[PDB]
Amino acid sequence: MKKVVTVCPYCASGCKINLVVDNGKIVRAEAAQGKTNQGTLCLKGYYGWDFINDTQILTPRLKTPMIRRQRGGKLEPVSWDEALNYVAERLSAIKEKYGPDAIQTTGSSRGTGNETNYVMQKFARAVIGTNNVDCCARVXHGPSVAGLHQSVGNGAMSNAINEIDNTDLVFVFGYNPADSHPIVANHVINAKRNGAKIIVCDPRKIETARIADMHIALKNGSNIALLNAMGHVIIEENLYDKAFVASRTEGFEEYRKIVEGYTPESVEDITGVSASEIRQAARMYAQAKSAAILWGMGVTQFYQGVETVRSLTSLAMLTGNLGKPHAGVNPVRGQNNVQGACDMGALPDTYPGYQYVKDPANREKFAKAWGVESLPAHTGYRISELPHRAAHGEVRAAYIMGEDPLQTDAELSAVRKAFEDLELVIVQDIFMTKTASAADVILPSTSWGEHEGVFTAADRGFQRFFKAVEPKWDLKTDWQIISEIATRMGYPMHYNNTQEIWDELRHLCPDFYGATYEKMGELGFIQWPCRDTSDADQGTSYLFKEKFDTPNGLAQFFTCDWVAPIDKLTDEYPMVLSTVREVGHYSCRSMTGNCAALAALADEPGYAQINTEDAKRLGIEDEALVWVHSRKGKIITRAQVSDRPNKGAIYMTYQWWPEYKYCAVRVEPIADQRAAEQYVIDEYNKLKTRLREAALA
Ligand SMILES: Nc1nc2c(c(=O)[nH]1)N[C@H]1C(S)=C(S)[C@@H](COP(=O)(O)OP(=O)(O)OC[C@H]3O[C@@H](n4cnc5c(=O)[nH]c(N)nc54)[C@H](O)[C@@H]3O)O[C@H]1N2
Ligand SMILES: Nc1nc2c(c(=O)[nH]1)N[C@H]1[C@@H](S)[C@H](S)[C@@H](COP(=O)(O)OP(=O)(O)OC[C@H]3O[C@@H](n4cnc5c(=O)[nH]c(N)nc54)[C@H](O)[C@@H]3O)O[C@H]1N2
Ligand code: SF4
Ligand SMILES: [Mo]
Known part of the structure; x- marks a missing residue:
């Protein structure tokens, strides 16, 4: 009976968990003293380790490689040799016929870990020869979609989760941590215990609104109208930080022009918020000595969403709530490793460590490190473009690891036809998902619990998680699978452990180089940048102390006009x-x-x-x-x-x-509830049985 330390595989709160192991099986889970959680877990960390054991309540664990030979056929179990050979041969053949950009890879934001994601993007780039690597959920990052990156030059949470506790005001906007990030909600609650004010901008009366000093219960979709009027009040009542604006920003005058028309009065009917409430909230936010904005992944979907993110960030620039502790702009994103996948360069325009592929110095370094003559410079395809690329023949193969688009992507018949239009779909997962069940080849990976690595938590905190238990079946880690495909495609790749992978990327990523395994250990929380291996460098709690990460180091103001949602209401x-x-x-x-x-x-x-x-x-x-x-x-x-x-x-x-x-x-x-109830049971049994048969064939 032993405790193995891990990190929760659910949300990005990054709770450390001691998995109790007795006789080779996990026996229970209990909170460890992680930086973020300090001996607490929500329901999911506490009870959610159970899936490892293949309960089959909803869907079975993937136990063997499978191949669907004919298109309208059955997935059949096959050996690893057969599967890995099949994939290496198909990918090679596709690369030679159509070019490397005919193949799409994904990273994975869930249990696999950072090392896997680094290996996948390495495979895409050094082996295949494409920048087509991306994640579904991703931090604000590219030229193709606006976000935080244009405002401050980094899409990360500017400040640590643990900094929330000593902010003077938590401005929660489009964010529901009570359900989304329970342990982050505990930090908000602790901030209030510590005397922070709390403003919640949310149409609903969420838990955090109960304890809020103001609940700005704004009409759904009214965001920019509210945000602009708040900026209007802050500018017109002279509540902004003029020194900070002068020295650390540009674009103020153009922002001022737009918000000038947005009086609290002009926006009362649109927001459903009284002008008085708007003034008070804008005052409260502007007057707090240090204020942290928290928003959710979340805001970027309300659309005008990416403008809303910048309009929000502009409020923080306006008030100088950037480059100091217990302040900031803080998109708390969802998945346990959404941040880490991005850190590892599972994005189409960047190597790990936000070293852009467009820079020739970066290409030179990675190329040299990777023993390759040339690495591609042009931005790859986004996984969200897959249906379009597949339909028009630009992508012929998808290597989908640890994503479930046929469940979790908007319009499910789009990605379904995408899988039909594609020549080859490989799904690497731990469960018979809707997506895996529609694949040509299934490669079963080890799960969280059965392997180790590093996750990056919501605020860019690197943490180690350890292997608690052996897989019961012949499984490979995700990076083992990729490496073997890579080698069978003619590119020597193997690792004996995740430390080897992590140490390689460390030497290629100046902002991760200091974050050794030893520094992270069982309970260490190392936020990047961490540049020196010396134990003197324990990471960066908050970003932008000296300058922003924008080309000229100044933060960039932005907002725009409010535009009513496209789907209007009717009778x-x-x-x-x-x-x-x-x-x-x-x-x-x-x-x-x-x-x-x-x-x-x-x-x-x-x-x-x-x-x-x-x-x-x-x-x-x-x-x-x-x-x-x-x-x-x-x-x-x-x-x-x-x-x-x-x-x-x-x-x-x-x-x-x-x-x-x-x-x-x-x-x-x-009217007929009993028939509708039965119908629900009927359809759930259908799906359960379908995925069952897919798996035990
Ligand atoms: N328990 C649990 N937690 C999870 C997850 C899970 O599946 N279960 N998934 C994780 C993932 S991947 C993600 S992306 C996150 C998502 O977590 P969030 O970032 O919190 O996204 P939501 O809960 O969907 O939306 C948050 C809030 O937006 C409010 N809202 C809706 N419309 C508007 C609007 O027009 N303006 C404003 N200001 N607010 C609005 C909603 O009322 C809600 O309270 O959750 C993460 N955590
Ligand atoms: N319409 C609509 N579209 C949206 C969203 C929405 O709300 N609505 N959300 C967006 C973001 S916020 C979300 S987080 C994202 C979710 O898709 P994804 O990450 O692929 O699904 P996931 O369900 O979390 O699937 C993760 C898979 O990973 C498997 N898995 C988990 N651990 C491992 C592992 O260690 N190795 C491997 N190979 N796989 C693993 C899971 O089983 C799952 O199938 O897509 C965006 N699109
Ligand atoms: S708050 Fe998130 S990371 Fe922590 S135990 Fe709950 S689901 Fe896991
Ligand atoms: Mo997400």
Whole structure:
């Protein structure tokens, strides 16, 4: 009986967990003293280790390689030799026929770890010869989509999670940590215990709003209108930091011109917030000695979302809430390793350590390190473009590792046809997912629990996680799989352990070089940049102390005009639909839904939060199934009738089996509940049986 230290594989809070191991099996999980969690876990860390054991509650663990030889055929189990040879031969053949850019790779933001992601992008670049490497969820980063990067030159959380506790004001905008990042919510609560003020800008009455000094309950989609009026108040009442603006920013005058028209009064009907409330919130934010903005992954989907991110960041620039502790702009992103995948250069325009492929010095270094003559300079395809590339023949093969697009991507029949248009789809996962079940080849990897590595938490904190248990089947780690494919394609690659991979990237990434395995250890939390291996360098708590990471080191102001959501409301569709996380289950659900304790918590088809008054009016009872009508769409869901959602909007916990957050819908009650209930059981049994048969064939 021993404790093996790991990091939670769910959200990006980065909680350290001691997995109790007795006789080669995990026996229970308990909170370890991680930097972020300090002996606490939410439900998911505590009960969510159970999927490792292949419970088969929702879907089985992948146990063997598989190949679907004919297109409308069965996945058949095969040896590793057969699978890895097949893939190396197909990829090689595709590369020679169509060029390297005909192949798309993905990183993975989940249990695999940082080392895997570095290896995947190495494979794409040194072996295949393409920059086509990307992750679904990604930090604000590229030229093709606006974000934080244009404002401050880094898409990361500017300040640590542990810095939240001593901020004077937490400005939570489009963010629900109580359900999304329970341990981050504990830091917000502790900030309030420590006397911080709290402003929540959220249409709904979320948990954090209960403890908020102001809950700005703004109409769904009204974000830029509110943000501009807040900037208007800050500028017109002279509450901005003039020194900071003069010396550390540009673009003020152009921003001032736009927000000048946006009086709190001009925006009362649009935001549903009184001008007085707008003034008070803008005052509270501007007057706090140090204020941290927290927002969610989240804001970028409300669209005007990427403008909203910059408009928010502009508020922090306006008030000098950047380049000092307990302040900042802090997109707390979702997945346990969304940050790390990006750190490892699982993005189409950059090597690990945000060393852009367009720089010839960077190409030279990596090329030399990687024993290759030339590395490609042009930006690869984004995984979100896959349906378009596949349809038009630009991408012929997808190597999809640790992503489930046929579950978790907008319009599921788009990526389905994408898989049809593609010549070859490889899925490397730990479960028979919807996506894996539609693949040509399945490569089963080890899971979190069965291997080790490094994750990067929400605030760029590198942490080690250790192997607790041996895989029960003949599994390879993700990086073992890639390395073997790489070698079979003519490029010698092998590693004996993740430290070898980590040490290689350290020597290629000046901002990660100091973050040795020894420095991270069992409980260390090392935020990058960490440049010196000396134990004197323990990382960077917050960014931008001296300058910003923009070309000329000045932060860049931005906002724009408010534009009403594209899906307008009608008498035919009088409700807003938006999506929302729930604490007890995680998104893919292949992990939480395969945990006996967590699975007992959440019913199918899932829940839709409806306002009490809306429900009264519509004849919708609590717990009663309901239909939700959009356009080219209708869905069945369960009513969670509460006063938490705002009247006029329903919030679906959409984890169940580009404006994701605003959508015009109608909600109709079901007369025959018993038939609708049976129907739900019927469809869930269908899917469960389908994935079962896919796996045990
Ligand atoms: N328990 C659990 N936690 C998770 C996950 C999970 O599946 N389960 N998934 C993780 C992942 S991958 C992600 S991306 C995160 C997502 O977590 P979040 O970043 O928190 O995204 P949401 O919860 O979907 O939306 C957050 C808030 O946006 C509000 N909102 C909706 N419309 C508007 C608007 O127009 N303006 C404003 N200001 N607010 C609005 C909603 O009411 C909600 O409270 O959760 C992460 N954590
Ligand atoms: N319409 C719409 N579109 C959206 C989103 C939305 O809300 N709505 N969300 C966006 C972001 S926020 C989310 S996090 C992202 C989710 O997709 P993804 O990461 O691929 O699914 P995932 O479910 O987390 O699947 C992760 C897979 O990884 C497997 N896995 C987990 N651990 C490992 C491992 O160690 N090795 C390997 N090879 N695989 C592993 C999981 O089983 C799962 O299939 O896509 C964006 N698009
Ligand atoms: S899901 Fe998030 S808050 Fe909960 S134990 Fe895991 S890392 Fe911590
Ligand atoms: Mo996410």
